[PDB]
Design a protein around this ligand. Structure first.
Ligand SMILES: Cc1cccc(C(=O)Nc2cc(-c3ccc4c(c3)CCO4)ccc2N2CCN(C)CC2)c1
Ligand SMILES: [Cl-]
Length: 310
């Protein structure tokens, strides 16, 4: 555009590939940190690996005895961890597909998992209301945090692994010191907190609550900076993201089968992506390219890859 009448930055995500193969609801999609792969987890008890740029099916990883709610990559893209209804997490060698460790400790469904950036630790969240911290090398549980008084919906390490953020159906978001296991901040108001993650910087958290609201928090200050609405979220633990490769967006799934994209600053809905035929429970943003992956529930069972110019 021009200096006097500038072109507003609005994304133009368009559907590129639909990835079919899971035989039940898909729970989670994650891009490998090296940008090459997408991993998906499903109620079909399987993990599948796909080409990030071409949607090509790569491999099926099996071993869990019940449905899988989450999958996460190690920082060098060599390992995966998965969280399952069978009360365990498993660590997987990406190359061979083999189960390297089974992480035993949780007393009920495991819903969420992540490696720390150093990738010597895994954090998990469970229906059993605990957050657990595990040694990657040994598969041993190092700490059981008495984290919440209701199911844990999300767990995330910050950029240097020194903090963990957790969210729960108890209505709280908590910030934990990785080393000590101590709670350093509680955000409290509240409906169930269905999702949380740290900003790419680490200075902010983004939290979803089951009142159709996403909020951007300055956690240390305890001040809510932004609110994002216009989507439907009153039931499912829907995964949202910071999109920072091009323009600065917030991306989320929705119970009206759409992917919503907001301008992070203006809180305005800049795009709504149509195509899925059930609740979009998971979104992921590619580490380097303007690529969104989205995944949907039982009436859909597919992953979609969307590409933008900004
Ligand atoms: C096997 C499978 C397939 C499709 C969806 C789900 C599911 O909805 N997961 C789940 C359930 C609950 C959950 C919460 C409360 C509760 C239940 C489940 C049953 C009774 O009360 C909380 C979190 C999650 N996660 C977190 C990770 N995310 C990437 C996905 C969704 C699971
Ligand atoms: Cl993530």
């Amino acid at each position: 555009g021009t200096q006097s009448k500038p072109t507003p930055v609005k994304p133009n995500y368009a559907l590129k590939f639909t990835l079919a193969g899971h035989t039940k609801a898909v729970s989670s999609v994650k891009f490998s940190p090296n940008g090459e792969w997408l991993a998906s987890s499903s109620a079909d008890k399987l993990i599948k690996i796909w080409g990030a740029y071409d949607g090509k099916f790569e491999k099926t990883i099996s071993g869990h005895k019940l449905g899988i709610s989450d999958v996460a990559w190690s920082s060098d893209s060599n390992l995966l961890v998965s969280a399952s209804d069978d009360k365990t997490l498993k660590i997987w060698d990406v190359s061979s597909g083999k189960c390297l460790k089974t992480l035993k400790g949780h007393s009920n469904y495991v819903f969420c998992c992540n490696f720390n950036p150093q990738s010597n630790l895994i954090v998990s969240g469970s229906f059993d209301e605990s957050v657990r911290i595990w040694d990657v090398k040994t598969g041993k549980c190092l700490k059981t945090l008495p984290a919440h008084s209701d199911p844990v919906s999300a767990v995330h390490f910050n950029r240097d692994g020194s903090l963990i953020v957790s969210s729960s159906y108890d209505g709280l978001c908590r910030i934990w010191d990785t080393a000590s296991g101590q709670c350093l901040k509680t955000l409290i108001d509240n409906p169930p907190v269905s999702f949380v993650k740290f900003s790419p910087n680490g200075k902010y958290i983004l939290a979803a609550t089951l009142d159709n609201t996403l909020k951007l928090w300055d956690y240390s200050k305890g001040k809510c900076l932004k609110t994002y609405t216009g989507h439907k979220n009153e039931k499912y633990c829907i995964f949202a993201n910071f999109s920072v490769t091009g323009g600065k967006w917030i991306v989320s799934g929705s119970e009206d089968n759409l992917v919503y994209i907001w301008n992070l600053q203006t809180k305005e809905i800049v795009q709504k992506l149509q195509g899925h035929t059930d609740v979009v429970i998971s979104t992921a943003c590619h580490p380097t390219e303007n690529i969104i992956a989205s995944a949907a529930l039982e009436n859909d069972k597919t992953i979609k890859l969307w590409k933008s110019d900004c």
